[PDB]
């Protein structure tokens, strides 16, 4: 997470991020819409940060410092590079829409009027197919990853010291290994709530209301597909047990 984006999203809301003289130029309904869009982008920035802690802090530290077998590290952090690729691209598109909307002479005053089209693009076509494939794989490997982590923490001294060392800083308080895995699993089910609330305050332009209505439907289709493609993998569960899920 770079300083520029952290500072742009430091405030608890859009209404506290923009200059108060700029805030006063907008209707109440536009303020409400912008506050929810700001929450979507700020939580996406945090989710991309969670994925960077998993790839750079945990995964790479285990490979370079503990010299763990790539297969063990893969079991602990399944699909992390694919997940990071999906969300860093989506975050880049969100931040570019904000950057283009900035008033000349300002690095904080903006209004995003056309989010719907960006959401339709993210949740349709090849990007939706990749999100569905990646989350169906990740969520099916969730239980296996937590069990593999617990076994390593309890039986390997160097692994326990590594974890305690890299998770000691206060900035990592909410981001232990298991915490990162659940943060990532829960991310996809936050989108409908955020989109529906943005839609609630986007009736001013009929085309925007229609675009968000389509986007909400696409996110729900994606979640139903992922939910239907999940089966918890279990190391040691013989094929005789797969049949009764």
């Amino acid at each position: 997470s770079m300083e520029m984006d952290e500072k742009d999203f430091a405030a608890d809301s859009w209404s506290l991020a923009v200059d108060s003289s700029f805030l006063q130029q907008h209707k109440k309904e536009v303020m409400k819409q912008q506050d929810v869009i700001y929450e979507l982008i700020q939580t996406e920035l945090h989710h991309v940060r969670t994925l960077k802690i998993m790839t750079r802090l945990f995964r790479t530290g285990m490979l370079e410092e503990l010299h763990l077998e790539p297969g063990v590290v893969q079991g602990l952090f399944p699909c992390v590079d694919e997940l990071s690729d999906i969300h860093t691209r989506f975050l880049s598109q969100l931040l570019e829409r904000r950057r283009q909307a900035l008033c000349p002479g300002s690095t904080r005053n903006f209004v995003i009027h056309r989010l719907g089209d960006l959401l339709i693009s993210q949740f349709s076509g090849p990007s939706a197919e990749q999100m569905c494939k990646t989350y169906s794989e990740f969520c099916s490997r969730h239980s296996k990853a937590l069990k593999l982590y617990k076994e390593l923490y309890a039986r390997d001294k160097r692994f326990q010291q590594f974890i305690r060392k890299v998770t000691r800083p206060a900035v990592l308080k909410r981001h232990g290994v298991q915490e990162c895995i659940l943060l990532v699993t829960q991310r996809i089910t936050k989108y409908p709530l955020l989109i529906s609330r943005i839609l609630q305050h986007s009736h001013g332009i009929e085309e925007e209301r229609q675009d968000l209505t389509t986007a909400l439907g696409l996110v729900k289709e994606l979640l139903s597909n992922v939910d239907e493609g999940i089966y918890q993998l279990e190391k040691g569960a013989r094929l005789q047990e797969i049949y009764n899920r």
């Binding site: 608890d12 809301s13 209404s15 506290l16 506050d35 929810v36 929450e39 939580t43 945090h46 969520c139 969730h142 239980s143 937590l146 308080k173 909410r174 298991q178 915490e179 659940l182 943060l183 699993t185 829960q186 996809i188 089910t189 936050k190 989108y191 409908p192 709530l193 955020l194 609330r197 979640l223 139903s224 992922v226 939910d227 239907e228 999940i230 089966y231």
Partner: protein, 179 residues
């Protein structure tokens, strides 16, 4: 400071997201109430014991039966929520949420929490519910449901005014520490 994990379950309109937000900030937001809650690790000292209590929401997972149980592994205490302004949310507790939590979290204490207690004597709430032949949940109806489901205890709170919020999480911490 031992680490304990708390998960809140309940219907979409039970107020679980707001309860987590108000507790974690010790404040009902004055400018913007967030739509979602990511996670939080609260430092709580209850009866002389210091605990790091990790908090998790299940909001948005209600329609996904294979995604939702991924929130449950290693849970130490469950907050099972209903809204006092919604007798329908209380009816869904014994045969939807309770058998699910007992399956994925066997032997984990469950605290039944009646949220939005400030709406029990709200005239707009009472007029609205009377159209569907209903009324705000009474404290004894909450206690009887908690007794029926084998809850560890029954508690009420209001995220709006903060009354009872600290008590709910301090009791959850005590329940998470028990054998």
């Amino acid at each position: 400071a031992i680490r304990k994990k708390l998960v809140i379950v309940g219907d979409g309109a039970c107020g679980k997201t707001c309860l987590l937000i108000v507790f974690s900030k010790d404040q009902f937001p004055e400018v913007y109430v967030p739509t979602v809650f990511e996670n939080y690790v609260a430092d709580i000292e209850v009866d002389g014991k210091q605990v790091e209590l990790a908090l998790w929401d299940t909001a948005g997972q209600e329609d996904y039966d294979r995604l939702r149980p991924l929130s449950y592994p290693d849970t130490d205490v469950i907050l099972m929520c209903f809204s006092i302004d919604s007798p329908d949310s209380l009816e869904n507790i014994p045969e939807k949420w309770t058998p699910e939590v007992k399956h994925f979290c066997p032997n984990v204490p469950i605290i039944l929490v009646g949220n939005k207690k400030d709406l029990r004597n709200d005239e707009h709430t009472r007029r609205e519910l009377a159209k569907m032949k209903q009324e705000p949940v009474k404290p004894e109806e909450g206690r009887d449901m908690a007794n029926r489901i084998g809850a560890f205890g029954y508690m009420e709170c209001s995220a709006k005014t903060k009354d009872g919020v600290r008590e709910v999480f301090e009791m959850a911490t005590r329940a998470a520490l028990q054998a």
